[PDB]
Design an enzyme around this catalytic site. Sequence first.
Site, PDB file in Angstrom:
ATOM      1  N   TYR A  27       0.834  -1.023  -0.027  1.00 55.46           N
ATOM      2  CA  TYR A  27      -0.285   0.430  -0.147  1.00 55.46           C
ATOM      3  C   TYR A  27       0.347   1.559  -0.106  1.00 55.46           C
ATOM      4  CZ  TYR A  27      -3.877  -3.132   0.358  1.00 55.46           C
ATOM      5  OH  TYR A  27      -5.293  -4.087   0.550  1.00 55.46           O
ATOM      6  N   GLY A  29       2.776   3.806  -1.537  1.00 59.54           N
ATOM      7  CA  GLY A  29       3.155   4.034  -2.857  1.00 59.54           C
ATOM      8  C   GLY A  29       2.062   3.843  -3.573  1.00 59.54           C
ATOM      9  N   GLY A  31      -0.289   0.896  -6.052  1.00 58.78           N
ATOM     10  CA  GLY A  31      -1.864   1.480  -5.651  1.00 58.78           C
ATOM     11  C   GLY A  31      -1.467   0.650  -4.577  1.00 58.78           C
ATOM     12  N   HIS A  47      -3.627   4.306   5.062  1.00 60.30           N
ATOM     13  CA  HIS A  47      -4.364   6.275   4.221  1.00 60.30           C
ATOM     14  C   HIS A  47      -4.803   6.156   3.088  1.00 60.30           C
ATOM     15  CE1 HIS A  47      -2.021   8.835   2.099  1.00 60.30           C
ATOM     16  NE2 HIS A  47      -2.008  10.342   2.744  1.00 60.30           N
ATOM     17  N   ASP A  48      -4.956   5.114   2.325  1.00 60.75           N
ATOM     18  CA  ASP A  48      -5.527   4.786   0.686  1.00 60.75           C
ATOM     19  C   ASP A  48      -6.604   4.973   1.136  1.00 60.75           C
ATOM     20  OD1 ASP A  48      -2.520   4.648  -0.384  1.00 60.75           O
ATOM     21  OD2 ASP A  48      -3.368   2.498  -0.558  1.00 60.75           O
ATOM     22  N   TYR A  51      -7.891   8.327   1.656  1.00 60.21           N
ATOM     23  CA  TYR A  51      -7.819   9.013   0.507  1.00 60.21           C
ATOM     24  C   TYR A  51      -9.335   8.790  -0.049  1.00 60.21           C
ATOM     25  CZ  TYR A  51      -3.772  11.894  -0.058  1.00 60.21           C
ATOM     26  OH  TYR A  51      -2.841  12.558  -0.121  1.00 60.21           O
ATOM     27  N   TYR A  67      -4.460  21.188   0.692  1.00 58.99           N
ATOM     28  CA  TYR A  67      -4.771  22.140   1.981  1.00 58.99           C
ATOM     29  C   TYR A  67      -3.865  23.213   3.212  1.00 58.99           C
ATOM     30  CZ  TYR A  67      -2.005  18.279   3.347  1.00 58.99           C
ATOM     31  OH  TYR A  67      -0.846  17.581   3.186  1.00 58.99           O
ATOM     32  N   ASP A  93      -3.651  12.946   5.600  1.00 59.43           N
ATOM     33  CA  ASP A  93      -1.940  12.864   5.181  1.00 59.43           C
ATOM     34  C   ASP A  93      -1.379  13.148   6.747  1.00 59.43           C
ATOM     35  OD1 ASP A  93      -2.044  12.719   2.627  1.00 59.43           O
ATOM     36  OD2 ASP A  93      -1.722  14.659   2.253  1.00 59.43           O
TER      37      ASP A  93
END
Lengths: 119, 5
Positions: A27, A29, A31, A47-48, A51, A67, A93
């Site tokens: 995960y 970096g 896909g 984190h994915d 998003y 942001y 993030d």
Amino acid sequence: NLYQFKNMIQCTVPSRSWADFADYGCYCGKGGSGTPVDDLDRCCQTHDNCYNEAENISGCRPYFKTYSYECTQGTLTCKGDNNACAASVCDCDRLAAICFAGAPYNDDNYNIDLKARCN
Amino acid sequence: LAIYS
């Protein structure tokens, strides 16, 4: 945005170049898809997912959204002047970076064959 | 030029 995520990583994890995290596990970096090889991969997996949820907010693009944040004296802060989307992204993030600072780093899990272990 | 996640 990623430039900012980059800068976030660089302020919570000084001793380690951000590149170290741009191609790790299944995960970090690249896909994704599959069971996280480890905790650091789990940080990224989460984190994915973050998003993807943010993507639900119309006109919200996790990668290009700029942001408002700041990192000083070892403190990562998402500012108040962010709309729903920017706020969400920022926090994604932010949580990730903090997660990175607390997880071990296995070199065996850097740039593993995605296709045979996760595409 | 390229990504983390």
